[PDB]
Design a protein around this ligand. Structure first.
Ligand SMILES: Cc1cc2nc3c(=O)[nH]c(=O)nc-3n(CC(O)[C@H](O)[C@H](O)COP(=O)(O)OP(=O)(O)OC[C@H]3O[C@@H](n4cnc5c(N)ncnc54)[C@H](O)[C@@H]3O)c2cc1C
Ligand SMILES: Cc1cc2nc3c(=O)[nH]c(=O)nc-3n(CC(O)[C@H](O)[C@H](O)COP(=O)(O)OP(=O)(O)OC[C@H]3O[C@@H](n4cnc5c(N)ncnc54)[C@H](O)[C@@H]3O)c2cc1C
Lengths: 586, 586
């Protein structure tokens, strides 16, 4: 409509087609033959194809299909394009570009490359810029950004190492003759295994870009203008490349509290996953999910672990669930300094760089009542949040609006305040900071830009899992958010404790695993929020995310039959409401 | 309509009410105080509530709420009931009953007690009869039927014991200093733990009934007439109880091949889960899920196991998945005798009871080409199916029709050929033979009988899981059933192999785990069947079964954001179709 204008202007190569057109087939065939990638709109498959079809004439003077366009320019019908092909002019035609690239992606984590690959599918010439600025202590890593190198992957693996600890304890109860008390964990062995897989993922990412004819540049990018990006390469060589669309996907880096010794002596999660030695007696500063995930596996690997909590656990998360996650960790080796903040870190012993041992630090802090905190630790980890650094990008002078937190202010289609610039992933203000969200948005946007797609990313009801020793899966609203949003008398919570069959013989807790469904009474008992604390919580939660996406109700869960025996089946037979005051025990 | 008539006719105690009527609140409160349980139809919550309220006068001669009925008789309004209460006549009135019981349930396994507990909710006086006839070697057990004693619970527990073997192997790779090769397993220790848990379940089942004021008699039941049941108690005392409604829920028992040596020398799953000694070198006859589940954990516990397969694995399941399941087992030590059946079993050595060891058995059989089979085993397990035993219930004389397999024939509301007699669980012909189905169907039936419910059980797309060493979860159609039902050109199959992140560091198989969605093109790529082979298949599959119940399409799956990192998230990004010929490999 006007959709057509935008579509024709921004597509690199696009064919307007109908599935019942043998000339369309022929055209598509020669493009496949010539190995030319392009978008394709099948007008017969759109409810308004006829309107679009007629409207094509304003760009090409014709109303028939197929019609092929390259960067806003009409190239021809079937016969016209076959001529170019037979005459060896087509490659030049499809490669004619006023910019160096159709698309320049700044940042090589989860979002950018997902967007790059997707865009390259439709013939967009694409560059991905990635540069990893080292941690204060000099830690650096390869392509794939946060998740691949210092996030989801190493976390989950170390988490599993942690879980295997519990299985070692449990095996005796299942008839296995194993004394856990003569078994030790070797941190180095674990770290090598982890770093091995990461390195494979680094290369995987490189190869993947290469396989999609996406250009990878290991360089720091900076915006000079809406279409000009300055790059600084390893050799300190500086140059300029131009692009039509620009995607900002630079992610964030961990914050350090502004206290003496923090930068010099502490580490963050950025360093943890490649640490040469077991952290030893550890203080984790922070109470986000990263803080607790790390505290948890370190404890499970037999570390002496303290978690310093400024206010509450898992801000943003259902607070009942947060408390249970915390209570589980406290009962399984993790100590909490509640309502406490650090004031300084001092060094008592340096790292033992020739025996592979940590040093020793003195941490001074205070509780909210003014009482002093003072304790020794071999390692201090800061998990007090993450921040973007788009200052170095020259965003604002190029006209990109940032919010008070330094994040990019975007419309619902990822568009910044500069029309050809977009942002995805962690730097996109207000969006859930998860990897599959970055990837999903990245792919959807690329389709809107280069294939004429109109589907927006839906950021609502994005399921999550916190991989604490007892995992916490969640999809949708927290109880207190649903009550805030809809009022108490419109909210029903169905809940139940449960005990995994596996825990029974292993003599583990009754009534620690717990799940609930928060529901809107007025909306046919609509499922607003799903929450489960238990093993494999992520595998449990995922399937339900689809049902919730589809607008699942309590009746939809009830009418579904359980798989037995599983933890998950408990969601299909919940009946005790909180309002009833009935016991949720097993 | 006539719904109102049926409801009043079969309800034990029922109150017609409105949420906004304080006299209704008042009445319900005195009933509660009196500990009188009843059904409640809140009329202002039924779209035809105004109709029903008028319709009630045909019974009570009044059109106001509350109205209370006992066993078909109008008892009074709020004032009349409170009058009986203050005259100390209320208990006597609600207990008046022409039969000993409102409901008699013959069989105390999965369905029976679920139905029993549910009916007691609404004031139905209920007996649950359970009796366990011992195996041929004299194995007996307590309450809770097959699942609790010789089914799902012991099976899964031992599966877990088996899985721990891989966990021990894996832990070495995650840094734990343990040599799996020097760790032994003790059958008895395991069996002690399992039986201890099974015992606490028997007890739980007994207490549960008691707490619900359901009478439990450990007796064998027999129909004498549509309302009379003969019970035979432990002391061989014989008597007759009467009931208004009867539910048959008597389950099935394992079958034996009609060959010499079978009964005398072999065992079945009824015996396995409490065997005094480890099976040893073992033949498993049969190829159903029970055969393979058992064979699998026996192998994982270091057993020498052979499975004898008459024709195929998992008849009734998707044969591609079946083959992958089998291949996995063969690769991890299960031997298969394919296209083979046994002809006789001979004893070579008797069971050694003073040493607590299995004996030795010669098995002779034959393959489909005639070639002979002759091998020695210490234990032969038959898993060749289950059969009902409704011979002893006297169905024929009373008029309850059975099919050719001796299972009860029932309409879609579980009713038998005798109007007041119903059948649930494994004996209900043509229903999914699974524990949660029995339970669900039981609970729904009790509501239709005693709480005026109208909801029938939907037996379609019931999800299952086979707890083989590598698990297989499924929901909906197999590919072959889908193709046969809809035509090849209307069926699209998306699939992908995957590697659990946990398997990376553990150095487990590339490209063995596998998932697929079987979809119908004509119907908006409707998901007809989901299949997944990998760890925790049951936890993964469960959530999707709600989405499938809701009519999920492929686009519903696609637009759901994955939880990362998990196995399940692979479902939200399937793109490779079988039709495309593209590789499903990671
Ligand atoms: C410890 C931890 C655990 C986590 N666990 C999970 C989890 O289990 N599940 C989950 O869904 N999410 C998890 N996350 C969140 C997560 O992984 C991020 O959401 C994801 O990495 C964001 O992807 P991104 O592409 O937006 O940014 P990033 O992955 O951070 O990548 C951006 C890249 O751009 C680079 N860059 C920055 N500036 C420039 C520049 N000027 N020029 C060129 N390149 C630049 C950066 O170095 C970086 O490599 C975790 C995060 C952390 C810190
Ligand atoms: C080895 C094995 C593993 C299994 N694993 C699973 C699984 O992982 N998941 C799953 O969903 N299903 C599983 N099943 C299926 C399963 O357990 C049954 O589907 C379930 O028990 C059916 O419930 P039921 O109440 O109909 O029958 P039952 O549980 O067998 O109960 C019937 C009870 O009534 C008793 N009875 C019989 N006659 C009389 C009489 N005249 N008087 C009084 N009492 C009587 C019986 O002794 C029995 O106790 C498994 C089955 C087996 C054999």
């Amino acid at each position: 409509s006007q959709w057509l204008q935008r579509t024709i202007e921004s597509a690199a190569v696009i064919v307007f087609s109908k599935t019942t057109c043998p000339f369309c087939k022929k055209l598509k065939d020669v493009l496949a033959e010539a190995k030319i990638k392009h978008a394709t709109i099948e007008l017969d498959q759109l409810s308004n194809g006829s309107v679009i079809q007629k409207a094509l004439s304003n760009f090409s003077k014709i109303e028939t299909v197929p019609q092929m366009f390259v960067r806003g320019k009409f190239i021809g019908d079937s016969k016209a394009v076959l001529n170019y092909h037979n005459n060896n002019q087509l490659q030049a035609i499809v490669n004619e570009n006023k910019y160096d690239y159709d698309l320049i992606i700044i940042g090589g984590g989860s979002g950018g490359l997902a967007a790059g690959k997707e865009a390259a599918k439709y013939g967009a010439k694409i560059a991905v810029l990635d540069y990893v600025e080292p941690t204060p202590m000099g830690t650096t890593w390869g392509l794939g950004g946060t998740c691949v190198n210092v996030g989801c992957i190493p976390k989950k693996l170390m988490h599993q190492a942690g879980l295997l600890s519990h299985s070692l304890e449990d095996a005796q109860h299942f008839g296995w003759s194993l004394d856990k008390s003569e078994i030790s964990h070797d941190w180095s062995t674990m770290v090598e295994g982890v770093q091995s897989h990461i390195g494979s993922l680094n290369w995987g990412y490189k190869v993947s870009l290469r396989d999609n004819a996406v250009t990878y540049l290991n360089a720091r990018g900076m915006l000079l203008s809406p279409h000009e990006v300055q790059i600084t390469e390893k050799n300190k060589k500086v140059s300029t490349i131009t692009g039509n669309k620009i995607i900002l996907a630079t992610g964030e880096r961990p914050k350090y509290p502004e206290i003496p010794g923090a930068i010099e002596y502490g580490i963050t999660s950025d360093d943890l996953f490649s640490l040469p030695y077991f952290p030893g007696k550890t203080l984790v500063v922070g109470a986000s999910y990263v803080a607790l995930k790390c505290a948890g596996f370190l404890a499970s690997l037999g570390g002496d672990v303290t978690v310093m909590v400024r206010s509450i656990l898992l801000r943003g998360f259902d607070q009942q669930m947060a408390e249970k996650v915390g209570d589980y960790m406290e009962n399984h080796g993790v100590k909490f300094a509640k309502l406490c903040v650090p004031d300084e870190i001092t060094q008592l012993k340096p790292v033992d760089t020739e025996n592979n041992k940590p040093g020793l630090l003195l941490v001074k802090g205070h509780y909210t009542d003014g009482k002093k905190f003072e304790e020794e630790f071999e390692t201090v980890i800061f998990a007090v949040g993450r921040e973007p650094q788009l200052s170095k990008l020259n965003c604002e002078a190029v006209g990109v609006k940032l919010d008070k937190n330094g994040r990019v202010v975007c419309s619902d289609d990822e568009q910044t305040t500069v029309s050809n610039i977009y942002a995805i992933g962690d730097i996109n203000a207000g969006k859930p900071q998860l990897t599959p969200v970055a990837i999903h948005a990245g792919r959807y946007l690329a389709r809107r830009l280069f294939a004429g797609a109109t589907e927006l990313t839906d950021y609502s009801n994005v399921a999550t899992t916190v991989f604490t020793p007892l995992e916490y899966g969640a999809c949708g609203l927290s109880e207190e958010d649903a009550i805030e949003k809809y009022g108490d008398n419109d909210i029903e919570v169905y809940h139940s404790h449960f005990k995994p069959l596996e825990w029974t013989v292993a003599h583990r807790e009754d009534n620690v695993c717990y799940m609930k469904l928060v529901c809107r009474i007025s909306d046919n008992m609509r499922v607003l929020g799903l929450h489960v604390l238990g093993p494999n919580a992520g595998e449990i939660t995922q399937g339900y995310a689809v049902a919730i996406k589809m607008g699942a109700t309590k009746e939809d869960f009830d009418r579904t039959i359980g798989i037995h025996p599983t933890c998950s089946e408990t969601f299909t037979t919940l009946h005790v409401t909180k309002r009833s005051g009935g016991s949720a025990a097993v």
